[PDB]
Ligand binder design. Structure first.
Ligand SMILES: Cc1cc2nc3c(=O)[nH]c(=O)nc-3n(C[C@H](O)[C@H](O)[C@H](O)COP(=O)(O)OP(=O)(O)OC[C@H]3O[C@@H](n4cnc5c(N)ncnc54)[C@H](O)[C@@H]3O)c2cc1C
Length: 453
């Protein structure tokens, strides 16, 4: 129980009622530092711990693919917390109003939530803080090393954040203590009812094709805390050995496929790191996978935390803002609208195959994601339009969308964030360029195109 994982958002008078855990980003019962610290505070106060989840009005800004994945996991989570005598309350509406009412109605003594550097999460905290008088804590249950402890500033490169994160690994990379159940069961609708209503409201915006059939294939990633563990065990036993040599081959499914579970917090990355470190395989493949789940994943939280405008052109490096500004008036070879990018109606078959995989599976390959967003910059009227188009298609169709990884991954491709300057080209400027011929020399582009017609 390292006290550096928990930060105080607002001090106040601790009430004589239960400790309330505000689950937002880490929807899981095991390996949850936020839930564990809530159980410790509750035990020292001689009071049980409760879990609350808010079903916000922003769910309609996404699709059914993300609403069903996250609600089906909550149905499994409600069972697991029930086995620990931990009641879970699911509220619908504004967190600033539903939590401020839950705290006063249930006589909350302490409020705890998990950490998320997103702007929407900071909006809820501001509304909640002004409506409560009890202590307010937050816990970094998503990163191995707390985001405010790994670095005190924004790291402009990976080679500057890697020594800082690895130097703190011997302290924060530890095993998880068991979640002690509540002593006695203590003293707002069914999740299946909220799922049917939410789907009926989202159906008119469902992604379809010509024959009115749905585009999403939900049999690729089963949601839940139990399904995340099976995926982790399959990757370590079957795909971890070849990850280093095939992570850039979209025609091979050699990736861990853990991101949708990682985004919703259905599995803890620290648990994944612990299992991989004890696994004996290719050292080059292990070093490559850890550089993705530790360095690049937690540097995305670092990027969103220390850059308020992480989704804007202002967060780009000075060399990239000046390079893009010098090529703003360059005549673009193509200009596609958001509807053409969404439907995959560009002249690039490789790009359309990446967009069709996104629409069909909700998880586009990591390598094509770099090509997918860089061509949005090349075929847009301005870098700002490319950012908004890339963010829209990402957050809407990616199962791991609306994530700090997504915003840091798009800032890297369009604005060179966490990258360096390359040869100066037109339109794109000094941003790293990925050509269609370059992808042909890296993998079989024909097999990837034919797989997603
Ligand atoms: C344009 C673009 C958009 C992106 N949008 C998303 C997004 O919406 N959501 C999202 O979680 N990630 C996004 N990524 C990061 C990355 O593409 C995915 O995390 C990765 O492809 C997820 O599939 P995986 O779990 O099988 O990858 P793996 O190769 O098995 O890696 C495991 C984990 O390492 C992390 N990771 C790997 N690569 C990156 C990376 N480049 N940046 C940050 N973390 C990484 C991820 O958490 C990932 O789950 C984006 C990257 C780009 C270039």
């Amino acid at each position: 129980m390292n006290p550096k994982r928990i930060r105080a958002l607002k001090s106040g008078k601790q009430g004589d009622g239960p400790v309330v855990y505000w689950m937002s980003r880490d929807q899981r019962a095991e390996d949850n530092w936020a839930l564990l610290f809530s159980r410790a505070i509750a035990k020292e106060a001689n009071v049980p711990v409760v879990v609350v989840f808010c079903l916000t009005d922003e769910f309609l800004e996404a699709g059914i693919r993300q609403y069903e994945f996250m609600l089906k996991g909550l149905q499994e989570l409600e069972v697991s917390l029930s086995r620990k005598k931990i009641p879970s309350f699911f509220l619908r509406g504004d967190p600033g109003e539903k939590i401020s009412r839950f705290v006063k109605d249930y006589n909350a003594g302490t409020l705890v939530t998990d950490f998320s550097p997103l702007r929407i999460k900071n909006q809820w905290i501001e509304k909640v803080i002004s409506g409560i008088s009890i202590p307010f804590f937050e816990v970094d249950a998503h990163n191995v090393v707390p985001c405010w402890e790994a670095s005190q500033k924004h790291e402009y490169a990976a080679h500057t954040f890697r020594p800082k994160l690895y130097a703190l690994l011997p302290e924060f990379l530890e095993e998880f203590p068991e979640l002690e159940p509540n002593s006695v069961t203590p003293e707002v609708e069914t999740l299946s009812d909220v799922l049917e209503t939410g789907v009926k409201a989202l159906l008119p915006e469902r992604a379809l094709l010509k024959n009115k059939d749905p585009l999403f294939e939900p049999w690729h990633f089963e949601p839940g805390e139990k399904a995340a563990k099976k995926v982790m065990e399959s990757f370590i036993a079957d795909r971890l050995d070849s990850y280093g040599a095939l992570r850039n081959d979209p025609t091979k499914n050699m990736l861990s496929n853990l991101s949708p579970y990682l985004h919703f917090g259905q599995i803890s990355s620290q648990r994944v790191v612990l299992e991989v470190e004890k696994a004996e395989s290719n050292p080059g493949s292990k070093k490559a996978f850890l550089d993705e789940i530790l360095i690049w994943k937690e540097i995305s939280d670092n990027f969103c935390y220390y850059n308020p405008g992480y989704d804007g052109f202002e967060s780009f490096p000075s060399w990239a803002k000046e390079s893009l500004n010098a090529h703003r008036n360059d005549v673009r070879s193509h200009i596609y609208t958001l509807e053409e990018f969404e439907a995959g109606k560009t002249h690039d078959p490789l790009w359309n195959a990446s967009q069709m995989e996104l629409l069909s599976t909700g998880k586009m390959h990591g390598y094509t994601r770099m090509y997918w967003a860089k061509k949005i910059l090349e075929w847009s009227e301005s870098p700002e339009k490319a950012l908004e188009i890339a963010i829209c298609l990402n957050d809407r169709y990616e199962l791991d969308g609306r994530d700090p990884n997504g915003y840091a991954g798009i800032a890297w491709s369009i604005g060179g964030v966490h990258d360096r300057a390359w040869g100066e080209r037109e339109v794109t400027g000094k941003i790293r360029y990925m050509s269609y011929e370059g992808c042909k020399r890296k993998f079989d582009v024909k097999l990837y195109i034919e797989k997603y017609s």
